[PDB]
Design a protein around this nucleic acid. Sequence first.
RNA 1: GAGGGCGCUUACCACUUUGUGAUUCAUGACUGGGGUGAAGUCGUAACAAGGUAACCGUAGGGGAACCUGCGGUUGGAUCA
RNA 2: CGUAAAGCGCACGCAGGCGGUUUGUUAAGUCAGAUGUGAAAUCCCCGGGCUCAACCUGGGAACUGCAUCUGAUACUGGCAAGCUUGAGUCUCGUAGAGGGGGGUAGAAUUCCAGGUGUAGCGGUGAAAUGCGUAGAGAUCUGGAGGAAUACCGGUGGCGAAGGCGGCCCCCUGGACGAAGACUGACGCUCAGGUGCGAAAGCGUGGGGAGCAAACAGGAUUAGAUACCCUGGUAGUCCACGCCGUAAACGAUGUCGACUUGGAGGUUGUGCCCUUGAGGCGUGGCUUCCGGAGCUAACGCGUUAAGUCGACCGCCUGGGGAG
RNA 3: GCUAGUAGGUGGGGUAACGGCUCACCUAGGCGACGAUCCCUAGCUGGUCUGAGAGGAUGACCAGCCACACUGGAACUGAGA
RNA 4: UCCCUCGCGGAUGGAGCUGAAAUCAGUCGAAGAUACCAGCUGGCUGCAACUGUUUAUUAAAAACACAGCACUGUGCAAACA
Lengths: 88, 267, 129
Amino acid sequence: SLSTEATAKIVSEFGRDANDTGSTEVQVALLTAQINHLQGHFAEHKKDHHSRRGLLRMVSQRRKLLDYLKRKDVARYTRLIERLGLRR
Amino acid sequence: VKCKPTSPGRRHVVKVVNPELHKGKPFAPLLEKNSKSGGRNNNGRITTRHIGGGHKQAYRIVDFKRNKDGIPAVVERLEYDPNRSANIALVLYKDGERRYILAPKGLKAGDQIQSGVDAAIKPGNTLPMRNIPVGSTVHNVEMKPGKGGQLARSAGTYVQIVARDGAYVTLRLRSGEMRKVEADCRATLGEVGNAEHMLRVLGKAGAARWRGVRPTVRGTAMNPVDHPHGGGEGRNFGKHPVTPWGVQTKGKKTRSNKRTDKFIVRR
Amino acid sequence: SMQDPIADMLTRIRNGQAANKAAVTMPSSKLKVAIANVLKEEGFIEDFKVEGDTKPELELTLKYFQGKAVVESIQRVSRPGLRIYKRKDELPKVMAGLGIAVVSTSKGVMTDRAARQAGLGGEIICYVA
RNA sequence: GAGGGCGCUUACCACUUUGUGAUUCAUGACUGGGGUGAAGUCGUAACAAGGUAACCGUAGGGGAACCUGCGGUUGGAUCA
RNA sequence: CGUAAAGCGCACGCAGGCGGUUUGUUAAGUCAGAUGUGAAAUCCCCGGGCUCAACCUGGGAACUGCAUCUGAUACUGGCAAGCUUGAGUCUCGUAGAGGGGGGUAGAAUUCCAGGUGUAGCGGUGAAAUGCGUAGAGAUCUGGAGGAAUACCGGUGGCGAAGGCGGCCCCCUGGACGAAGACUGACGCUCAGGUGCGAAAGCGUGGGGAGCAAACAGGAUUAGAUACCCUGGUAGUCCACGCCGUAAACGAUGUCGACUUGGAGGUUGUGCCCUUGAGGCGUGGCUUCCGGAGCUAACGCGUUAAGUCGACCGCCUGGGGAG
RNA sequence: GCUAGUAGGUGGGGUAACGGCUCACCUAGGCGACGAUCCCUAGCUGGUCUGAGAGGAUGACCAGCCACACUGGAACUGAGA
RNA sequence: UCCCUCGCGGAUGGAGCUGAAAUCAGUCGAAGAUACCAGCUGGCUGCAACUGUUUAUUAAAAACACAGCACUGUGCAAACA
């Protein structure tokens, strides 16, 4: 999954306050990590599909969140997509 | 294929097929320890064992046995050596020395590499069979304790021991079935050479065959003289062995020294 | 429901009746209570109330004359993806007139007769017989 | 003299011509399967536990139904 | 659309369709009024003239529509600010044959070698082929190799489906509970699209014990291109790529809300002289019986085939023909 | 999948009039699964027949519209072809 | 002309020099890729995949070779010569 020293870490970097593990800015960013980190994992094994299903989940789930931001505060979207080097 | 990296495959443009090239060994041009190489197949007079020709050669290169011992080598760089498809690596010791070796699998970028009795059991250097576990994967052993012959054909070429055999003799060459060999001998222990290195097809004679050996094909060709079979209206009937060799298996190698190897089946 | 909150109201009412239940409960809504108000005057339901100034929950009381129940027919019509809007001269007449038909007008929620007596039309809601 | 008409010529274009495809309909030595019929030969595949439970997929084989292997199904009889 | 024809083999998801709750606002949908126009003639109602009728004819009705204007604001839609029960995040636990990689163990088979020992073994309904005096079978010792993991194993568990069973490690997915804390409708479905798919089969290269299409013997039989017996190749195993089908079945699409009960299984949690095996609740998943209802009947029956709502796939007589 | 006068823009030209209608030059666009292009068929409508209706099938006779006049093409005269 | 360690420096300036194609317009002959030079094209079928090789001096082929495939032998003082 992800390490606490990391999950509880990042939350305090995107949260517009403290311990706001809910904030999209947070949750969303929290997803990119476990995603990028897994890309190195999927680079190996490959055939491991049952794990990619979850990978794709968090991916689309992440997008479902990005669309939201755009539909709640245009700024915050473009203001976060950079800090995460998203869009590619 | 089935590993990394796959082997390119030229596309239909001018009757073209499989090639051969590595990931890379950055440089295109050798060191200096090498000879001049002979030339043809002929034996101070007559041809002898027909077939053999074509140009392009040179480059001798060397090292085997590995007399040197407990002195830490470092892989300088993998390198391509002619005629034999088993790469070569370079390697420098902690005293500016520089042998060559038969590039094992996992190598490249520096790495450990140590020889002599009692040394890291990875794919570093030779090691007396004695000081070796089961060696499901040893290397270019030696029928004698000092030499380095055996399977220098590294390219995928392996050898399996038998955990702990006594009497001081073991090993299991590929199709060589079983065969005992002095245990006071040493093996590189790595045992590799990349197999795919020998998984492409030359292509279309000429620029792939000719660049090595002549038309190793004669078939009947008829003419009852040039070969123990010929003439006929347009077919063969009978026996077709050159110099009553009897290509019907037969087998050879009888009596004399050696021949004290074992098992050897017949399918 | 999560998609058809109004259609659920009817179902919860009819499902309760069959089970000879006493009172039906479910999340409230402006339109819901509005509808529940009509059936009240129409004698289809005893009474009705709600609870929660932030978490409202409708409370209806089923009804029955004799061995059988009263509301022995309650179905929807103008549902999503297939809404229905009639005029002052198209409004339906449930059970030849006996049964009522809830219809939202520019004046508010009414019945087949109600809106007609007014001379206006609206989006049909459901048929109650 | 202007200007105009005929005139020659230039452009647009009908007819008409030549290659080359596309499509459609008719037809053909022979050939494949389908359908009827009158039921002939040859066996008995399935329906009973149909007499080796059957069927689906896939593969191979055989006069013919069909036989055999691998997986799934109950749309299997008897207390398996 | 369970069995009659009909749920795509399963997922994810773009477009599309649909959208929890509140207030304001808008007035597009919608509703009301009105103004145009909707040719006349047909049709219809009332009424006229040919002696009646057909027919002819006055006026109206209608022309269900399109537009424009003035309003109405419940519902749908748009905009603004919200709200939390939907959905999601965080924490901490729980169970699991979920997946990918690598190890490793024990039982058995076969084979190779050697010891003991001797005329049978093997097989069938019998038999025969086959193996045996070149010494089998049996027995015992050592070795090689491959495939699958008894017992636990269950009416069990996990997975979207297909499927997934020894023990160990590494990488990894989902499900569920509980105090909670957080986001704030961010959701449901989904043609096309992308991906996953039993077995058999295909390509390259490995491997190959057992089993076994083909094939070969023996037997059965009227025949026996079979069932049975003795052998046995592909294949079954591995890697990597392809093929996409199955009675890919619950023959029952996904999501949500309602609607009597009984007995049981498995897993979480709260609580109870927790003194106990234990007892009382409260969630997840799952068996069997069954009420209302539904059904052509069989039967389904809170895990519905009952009562409803949103979206998608599909059917329209049999053969010919997937 | 379709489309070079093709989609648009400047200009001059042209018509009773807007306009790629036209020509030169500039841009590289315009159409399409809300079905383009392509093939088969077809005059459209008020209406007619059937039908409880919705709907289905149609478009004789009468009337509004369109097109054609032996076939293919062209312009002349004129308010008008 | 501008600048600098510094110089066969750098930058800006664009004189002179050279110079194709296209597009309109006109013109000559019977003819303008005018001479030399410089693919004939297509349709059906056998054989061999294909480049290549061969009877110097009557056979260039469908024959030899070829890459690929398979069988078999060879444990290195290898088999084989």
